[PDB]
């Protein structure tokens with residue numbers, strides 16, 4: 001009817017995830033994996049300010065810094081929708097090309 005345990009993994013590119021961090025597509029990267037919590041921002045104890053500033057990037061450095069509970073880290077497993085491209089993981093050989101416009 002309206003229930004389906006769909007488990008998959010979509011490999012997204014760095015330029016794709018860092019361009020979806022707006023409001024209803026706010027994704028965070030943890031352990032080089034893409035986690036969807038754009039509808040859990042207000043459900044996160046502490047606030048969304050710390051999430052929006054890490055949206056579209058890897059915040060694993062803060063995940064281990066703060067120290068999440070066992071159940072907490074297990075909960076994130078239900079918000080996994082994909083992973084980062086191998087080129088953006090064990091390569092990083094992709095031209096950025098930016099900051100060429102003076103909007104100051």
Ligand code: HEM
Pocket residue numbers: 028030035037044045046050051054059062063066067068069072075076
């Ligand atoms: C994006 C995935 C994340 C999930 C699913 C998540 C989930 C949770 C949950 C369930 C708790 C409370 C449970 C407990 O008692 O341990 C928690 C607490 C907390 N989280 Fe996260 N979190 C995430 C990311 C982050 C990130 C990226 C930061 C930092 C920018 C962060 C900072 C905190 C802090 C500070 C607390 C409270 C600990 C304290 O204030 O001493 N979380 N998180």
